[PDB]
Design a protein around this motif. Structure first.
Motif, mmCIF file in Angstrom:
data_model
loop_
_atom_site.group_PDB
_atom_site.id
_atom_site.type_symbol
_atom_site.label_atom_id
_atom_site.label_comp_id
_atom_site.label_asym_id
_atom_site.label_seq_id
_atom_site.Cartn_x
_atom_site.Cartn_y
_atom_site.Cartn_z
ATOM 1 N N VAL A 31 28.107 -17.017 -33.322
ATOM 2 C CA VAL A 31 27.645 -15.738 -33.007
ATOM 3 C C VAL A 31 27.710 -14.780 -34.799
ATOM 4 C CG1 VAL A 31 29.216 -13.401 -32.315
ATOM 5 C CG2 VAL A 31 29.667 -15.574 -31.122
ATOM 6 N N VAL A 32 26.685 -13.964 -34.606
ATOM 7 C CA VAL A 32 26.655 -13.710 -35.298
ATOM 8 C C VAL A 32 26.967 -11.545 -35.648
ATOM 9 C CG1 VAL A 32 24.857 -12.639 -37.749
ATOM 10 C CG2 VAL A 32 24.864 -15.234 -36.586
ATOM 11 N N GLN A 46 18.398 -5.367 -32.281
ATOM 12 C CA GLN A 46 18.034 -5.498 -30.914
ATOM 13 C C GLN A 46 16.542 -6.752 -30.799
ATOM 14 O OE1 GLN A 46 20.488 -2.605 -28.729
ATOM 15 N NE2 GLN A 46 21.708 -4.381 -27.991
ATOM 16 N N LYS A 47 16.047 -6.193 -30.868
ATOM 17 C CA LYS A 47 14.525 -6.154 -30.323
ATOM 18 C C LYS A 47 14.248 -7.301 -31.109
ATOM 19 C CE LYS A 47 12.636 -2.094 -30.282
ATOM 20 N NZ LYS A 47 12.914 -0.530 -31.421
ATOM 21 N N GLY A 53 15.887 -14.416 -27.364
ATOM 22 C CA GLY A 53 15.882 -15.322 -26.275
ATOM 23 C C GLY A 53 17.628 -14.797 -26.510
ATOM 24 N N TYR A 54 18.564 -14.094 -27.570
ATOM 25 C CA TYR A 54 20.267 -14.132 -27.406
ATOM 26 C C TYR A 54 20.614 -12.899 -26.994
ATOM 27 C CZ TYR A 54 18.705 -18.005 -30.514
ATOM 28 O OH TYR A 54 18.297 -18.948 -31.384
ATOM 29 N N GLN A 55 21.760 -12.739 -26.600
ATOM 30 C CA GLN A 55 21.990 -12.125 -25.820
ATOM 31 C C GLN A 55 23.421 -10.986 -27.324
ATOM 32 O OE1 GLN A 55 22.929 -11.571 -21.942
ATOM 33 N NE2 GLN A 55 20.932 -12.416 -22.825
ATOM 34 N N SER A 56 23.013 -9.457 -27.132
ATOM 35 C CA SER A 56 23.340 -8.504 -28.132
ATOM 36 C C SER A 56 24.249 -7.481 -27.591
ATOM 37 C CB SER A 56 22.899 -8.520 -28.746
ATOM 38 O OG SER A 56 21.598 -7.289 -28.100
ATOM 39 N N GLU A 57 25.381 -7.049 -28.316
ATOM 40 C CA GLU A 57 25.755 -5.786 -27.590
ATOM 41 C C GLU A 57 26.093 -5.169 -29.484
ATOM 42 O OE1 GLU A 57 26.787 -4.194 -25.384
ATOM 43 O OE2 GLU A 57 26.571 -6.011 -23.566
ATOM 44 N N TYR A 58 26.455 -3.628 -29.003
ATOM 45 C CA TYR A 58 27.056 -2.662 -30.180
ATOM 46 C C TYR A 58 27.928 -2.103 -30.011
ATOM 47 C CZ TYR A 58 23.489 0.735 -28.403
ATOM 48 O OH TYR A 58 22.901 1.672 -27.904
ATOM 49 N N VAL A 65 30.132 3.431 -39.168
ATOM 50 C CA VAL A 65 29.768 1.849 -38.783
ATOM 51 C C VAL A 65 29.617 1.654 -37.783
ATOM 52 C CG1 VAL A 65 30.116 -0.469 -39.324
ATOM 53 C CG2 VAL A 65 31.236 1.214 -41.104
ATOM 54 N N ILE A 66 27.831 0.739 -37.438
ATOM 55 C CA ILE A 66 27.764 0.531 -35.941
ATOM 56 C C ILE A 66 27.644 -1.188 -36.406
ATOM 57 C CG2 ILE A 66 25.669 -0.232 -34.297
ATOM 58 C CD1 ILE A 66 24.616 2.523 -36.252
ATOM 59 N N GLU A 67 28.324 -1.758 -35.767
ATOM 60 C CA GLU A 67 28.703 -3.380 -34.920
ATOM 61 C C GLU A 67 27.828 -4.163 -34.307
ATOM 62 O OE1 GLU A 67 32.508 -5.294 -36.039
ATOM 63 O OE2 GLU A 67 32.126 -6.561 -35.540
ATOM 64 N N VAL A 68 26.770 -4.598 -34.709
ATOM 65 C CA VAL A 68 25.704 -5.126 -33.744
ATOM 66 C C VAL A 68 26.088 -6.522 -33.356
ATOM 67 C CG1 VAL A 68 23.182 -5.961 -33.035
ATOM 68 C CG2 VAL A 68 24.291 -4.025 -34.456
ATOM 69 N N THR A 69 27.010 -7.043 -32.211
ATOM 70 C CA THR A 69 27.005 -8.564 -32.274
ATOM 71 C C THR A 69 26.324 -9.801 -32.005
ATOM 72 O OG1 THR A 69 29.081 -8.560 -32.240
ATOM 73 C CG2 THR A 69 28.753 -10.277 -31.110
ATOM 74 N N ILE A 70 25.425 -10.391 -31.869
ATOM 75 C CA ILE A 70 24.434 -10.997 -31.771
ATOM 76 C C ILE A 70 25.367 -12.432 -31.053
ATOM 77 C CG2 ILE A 70 22.660 -12.317 -31.495
ATOM 78 C CD1 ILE A 70 21.632 -9.733 -33.948
ATOM 79 N N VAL A 71 24.977 -12.851 -29.569
ATOM 80 C CA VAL A 71 25.384 -15.013 -29.341
ATOM 81 C C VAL A 71 23.961 -15.305 -29.490
ATOM 82 C CG1 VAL A 71 26.652 -15.787 -27.672
ATOM 83 C CG2 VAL A 71 27.354 -13.778 -29.104
ATOM 84 N N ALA A 72 24.351 -16.861 -29.201
ATOM 85 C CA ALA A 72 23.852 -17.906 -29.663
ATOM 86 C C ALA A 72 24.067 -19.109 -29.158
ATOM 87 C CB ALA A 72 23.468 -18.599 -31.133
#
Length: 74
Positions: A31-32, A46-47, A53-58, A65-72
């Motif tokens: 997770v990043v 997000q793009k 090909g990773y899922q993400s949310e924000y 502060v915007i937190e964007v979480t990217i999951v591999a």
């Protein structure tokens, strides 16, 4: 997990730091999360995530502060 504070950094820095962190996770995934201060960066993050090909949310937190979480894979 890995959290990148990219507040104050202008694009495409947040996205590059995020991509480097994701490409470094290997086949195991993980997770990043990235902290950014503008919607444009969130969109770029997000793009790039969809691109890879990773899922993400924000989530829009306090003080802009915007937190964007990217999951591999974590």
């Amino acid at each position: 997990m890995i959290t990148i504070d990219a507040l104050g950094q202008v694009c495409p820095i947040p996205v590059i730091r995020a991509k480097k962190a994701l490409a470094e996770l290997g086949e195991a995934g993980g997770v990043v999360t990235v902290l950014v201060d503008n919607d444009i960066s969130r969109q770029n993050l997000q793009k790039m995530a969809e691109g890879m090909g990773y899922q993400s949310e924000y989530l829009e937190k306090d003080n802009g502060v915007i937190e964007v979480t990217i999951v591999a894979g974590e």
